[PDB]
Amino acid sequence: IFSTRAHVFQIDPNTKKNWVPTSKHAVTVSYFYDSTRNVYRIISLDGSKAIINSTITPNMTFTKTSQKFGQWADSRANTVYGLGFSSEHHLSKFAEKFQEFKEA
């Protein structure tokens, strides 16, 4: 698996233009292979909340919007997740893993 830190956001449902903070601080975000479903997943837990529970689908894409912000649409969750990183370095390894775990 692979874990990292990031502030989480979701696009606003009404206009799908503005970002709404999901976490109040940075939280752990991990790529995990679920051996019970045989699929790769991106999860982020905060307290009793599963703020990210995205299953990676071959037609999913991760966009590096800026130096420290990346995002991906998840039709199952009916939203778009946005992650803010502490550096472009972290944004990059997150993006490369997205493609790696997608490619499998």
């Binding site: 970002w19 912000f69 803010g84």
Partner: peptide, 6 residues
């Protein structure tokens, strides 16, 4: 556009 300062 991303949330600041990202």
């Amino acid at each position: 556009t991303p949330p600041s300062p990202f």
